[PDB]
Design a protein around this ligand. Sequence first.
Ligand SMILES: *[C]C1=C([C])[C]=C2C(=[C]1)N([C][C]([O])[C]([O])[C]([O])[C]OP([O])(=O)OP([O])(=O)O[C][C]1O[C](N3[C]=NC4=C3N=[C]N=C4[N])[C]([O])[C]1[O])C1=NC(=O)[N]C(=O)C1=N2C#C[C]N([C])[C]1[C][C]C2=C1[C]=[C][C]=[C]2
Ligand SMILES: *[C]C1=C([C])[C]=C2C(=[C]1)N([C][C]([O])[C]([O])[C]([O])[C]OP([O])(=O)OP([O])(=O)O[C][C]1O[C](N3[C]=NC4=C3N=[C]N=C4[N])[C]([O])[C]1[O])C1=NC(=O)[N]C(=O)C1=N2C#C[C]N([C])[C]1[C][C]C2=C1[C]=[C][C]=[C]2
Lengths: 499, 494
Amino acid sequence: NKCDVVVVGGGISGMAAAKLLHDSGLNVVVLEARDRVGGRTYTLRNQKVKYVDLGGSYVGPTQNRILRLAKELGLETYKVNEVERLIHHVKGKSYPFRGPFPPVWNPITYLDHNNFWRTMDDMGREIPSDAPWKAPLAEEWDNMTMKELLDKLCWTESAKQLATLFVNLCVTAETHEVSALWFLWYVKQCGGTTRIISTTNGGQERKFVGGSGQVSERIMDLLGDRVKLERPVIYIDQTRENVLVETLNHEMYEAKYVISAIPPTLGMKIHFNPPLPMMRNQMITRVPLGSVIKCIVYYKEPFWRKKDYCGTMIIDGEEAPVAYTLDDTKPEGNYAAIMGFILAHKARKLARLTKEERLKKLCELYAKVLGSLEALEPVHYEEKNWCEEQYSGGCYTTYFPPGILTQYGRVLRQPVDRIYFAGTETATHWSGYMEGAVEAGERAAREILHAMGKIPEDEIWQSEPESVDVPAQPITTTFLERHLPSVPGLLRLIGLTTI
Amino acid sequence: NKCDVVVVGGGISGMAAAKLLHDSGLNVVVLEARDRVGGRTYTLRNQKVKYVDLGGSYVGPTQNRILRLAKELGLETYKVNEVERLIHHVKGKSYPFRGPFPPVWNPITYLDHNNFWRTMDDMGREIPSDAPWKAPLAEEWDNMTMKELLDKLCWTESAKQLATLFVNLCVTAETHEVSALWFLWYVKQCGGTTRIISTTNGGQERKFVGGSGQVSERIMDLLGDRVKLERPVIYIDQTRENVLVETLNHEMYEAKYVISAIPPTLGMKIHFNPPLPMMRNQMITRVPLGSVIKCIVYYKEPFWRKKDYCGTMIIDGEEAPVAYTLDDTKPEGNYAAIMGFILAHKARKLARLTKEERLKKLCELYAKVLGSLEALEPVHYEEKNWCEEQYSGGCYTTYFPPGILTQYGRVLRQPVDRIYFAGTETATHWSGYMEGAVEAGERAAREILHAMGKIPEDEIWQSEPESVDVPAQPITTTFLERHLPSVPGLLRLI
Ligand SMILES: *[C]C1=C([C])[C]=C2C(=[C]1)N([C][C]([O])[C]([O])[C]([O])[C]OP([O])(=O)OP([O])(=O)O[C][C]1O[C](N3[C]=NC4=C3N=[C]N=C4[N])[C]([O])[C]1[O])C1=NC(=O)[N]C(=O)C1=N2C#C[C]N([C])[C]1[C][C]C2=C1[C]=[C][C]=[C]2
Ligand SMILES: *[C]C1=C([C])[C]=C2C(=[C]1)N([C][C]([O])[C]([O])[C]([O])[C]OP([O])(=O)OP([O])(=O)O[C][C]1O[C](N3[C]=NC4=C3N=[C]N=C4[N])[C]([O])[C]1[O])C1=NC(=O)[N]C(=O)C1=N2C#C[C]N([C])[C]1[C][C]C2=C1[C]=[C][C]=[C]2
């Protein structure tokens, strides 16, 4: 019934917010729609897999908040396998390589590839992490899709195709679906192209031993009876002295403040009194989540390692159901597995198949890419289609279509009377990730602590010390990477020699 | 408690569906979230205005369903004033004209303008009204915004600017916000560019005497106690023999079938058991409504008529709050008024002002465009910002961002077990309009009648006889309009 703060949503963001408020001495209640906590993280346990993350999983250097929270909860990380060679599969052939980037040998294509990634980061530097709509060319960039930007920037089909794969993989959406400004912001606020794409020294460096679901589960353990499962919030009333929060199962909760720790669009599932201000009312109809099926195929042994492949495959082509894989073998070397993402339109297309049909397609793909008949002999299979989730709306996160971020972006974490907004979508560093969830939950919590006069304004936004366990190497470029001309740049240099 | 069909939403679509089912002998209940019916139609009555439509208002030739429904309810139409000259205001100067199209005098600009409108209709002819995703180039066109298409097609800034205004006015959204495929479908399914833009012989020919709100109000009168106001639906349960529909005020309704007659995205306000199928689950987060403030400025007299202006103004430029106006004077010639729409980003920008501040901006604009100091002396002002409406989400209708219509379009009116889908967004002719609302409501109703074995499959989709009161003249083109080259076509000839 009565508490200090109602937190709506028991994902990482809501749990992090509730923990901070609980630790500060406030009475908190978490109202969670599902029969479980974790939201877009979900760790399945059974005999065949031991444990497997079916949602958010990877953490890496510079994600210091999730690392600190998980450490405090008694969790440990392990390194994703990147010992052996990566594979880039393009036009039906596999090309093994080392490093974060597939090598390009053609001098023109090389210039084009180099310029693309460089320009992405160049443009990113003009975009404030906490206010992308304040970029000097915000309107121009926001009124373009990523498809249009790629069309302008890439002078080779090879660069365009790889850039397209990158967008699909990063934001589980098609290039024509998403704003260029938003996508450029998204990459920049993760620390740039190298940081976001890398396993070693990047976002995919590590996973949690036992699964990421333990973060939310262990906070629930600490909070005990304060977490209310199967309590979908349907109604928030702010007309009276205390905020009234009603659930689908007829329960009423009274609080001084509310944290909304759900994906922005899922705010639509709540009826508000009084009605939301116009900008938020419309914003929450304009911010969809992406489309993905996470698929894990299990094998007797990590046979790819014997062929000097680490299990990472970058697979281009419309025919391939999965565009990207990682070795998902346990740190102990057992429960050998390949994790793959079925992205964007392919998630839509292939969801029509049975689980068995998808497994067959994945195995046949892996067999060609790895050039191994062993890939046709899976021992087990797990998958999760996040598009079907009423209380997620998709995965990994919310994307912004053209025109939305500049018009509605400033509303995202603007308080509505006594409602404050968490959720990874409101983060300014690794928004979209578990890291962003922690940043947002704790920031929203501190906004309430400030509103109560418990902390100064200066303390709402808090810096995070670097993890000692997961140190971050700086992102470097070579002299040539910095100064080599683009394709049109080289052509302009040829045009000048003609005179 | 118990009935045959629960209709969720008491706008024109829900009311039309409920009326059809009621007339067929079924027990129907309409659950309406607001303290009123009408939804995106709303007629305000007071002493100063008599009546004024603050939402949907215009009807015209080829919109035979709304005309028939309104007639049956005892409503009449009158003609919007287009006797005198229209005005095109561009680069700070007013250019009076006659006919539906503002003239272009620069020869190259003429070719470019002509080609743009012609190409819009050409492209539309390849788009099936009932399945736009089946267009031969559906994917190509859906993966482009209207901004991109305009950038490709328009060789002059003049044509591009007017085309932009057209998009903003048509769908209350920016050109960069909307799919080219969806927009081209939208125009085609209203009967093409001329039909959609025209007052005389087009969508804006007429209004209802007494206001369009009377359509929903008069059906509510017929249904009586069957319409439940202030009953926002929060929960639909289809796991049992009968469908259970729960409202915010704690009431439970049991039915054999449900019609959802709300904007697709407002389906998000309902928790579903079992969960919606994946495609619909995601679709309803991908389909926003546009942004508009409808503003009506009242004057002592329709002074513009004295200067041989009808009151229609097409106003170019970022500075102008309103891009398009019509005379909103009563058929009797009193309650003189100019109606204007504040569109898309301007609705967002100008909503920050006070009502009085917006009035001042509108009056100053009208004084400039009409060249009349009389515009600075309003006697009254009414406005409605539809962006603030929890149970509409915007106006006039739902738009599709790039990539959505091909991926999710087929889900729009696909039944989910015993839930059938109405709402103007599911119409195939004048979707977005009151006409589409009637088409969709009656079609959804008939789907249920078929499911009950009461009518054959052949009768789900029903043709509508042409209105005798509002006859449609055919849309014609001239030989030169058909065969004059585009700008790149002329350059290829050179
Ligand atoms: C799904 C997913 C997947 C599949 C994958 C992934 C992911 C996901 N991610 C993301 C994460 O997960 C996120 O971010 C988080 O989790 C979020 O959190 P938050 O914010 O908290 O949210 P959520 O969870 O959702 O929660 C919410 C809650 O609430 C609730 N509700 C609703 N509604 C309601 C409620 N309640 C009451 N009432 C009402 N009404 C619900 O239920 C819930 O619970 C991720 N992340 C990270 O970090 N990591 C990872 O890994 C992940 N993942 C992914 C990724 C991928 N990647 C990275 C890729 C690979 C390679 C590459 C990439 C990218 C880029 C480059 C490269
Ligand atoms: C808003 C608006 C405005 C401002 C204007 C306009 C409009 C609008 N429009 C549209 C109409 O209105 C529509 O379409 C209709 O109305 C629709 O119907 P429906 O489908 O039925 O829907 P609604 O109304 O929305 O209803 C729904 C209902 O439901 C309810 N709910 C929700 N949720 C819920 C509920 N319930 C229970 N539960 C829950 N959960 C609500 O409340 C409601 O009631 C229009 N239309 C026509 O026809 N006309 C007109 O006029 C209109 N408007 C406009 C237009 C414009 N224009 C035409 C322009 C001028 C010149 C030109 C143009 C365009 C193009 C070219 C040229």
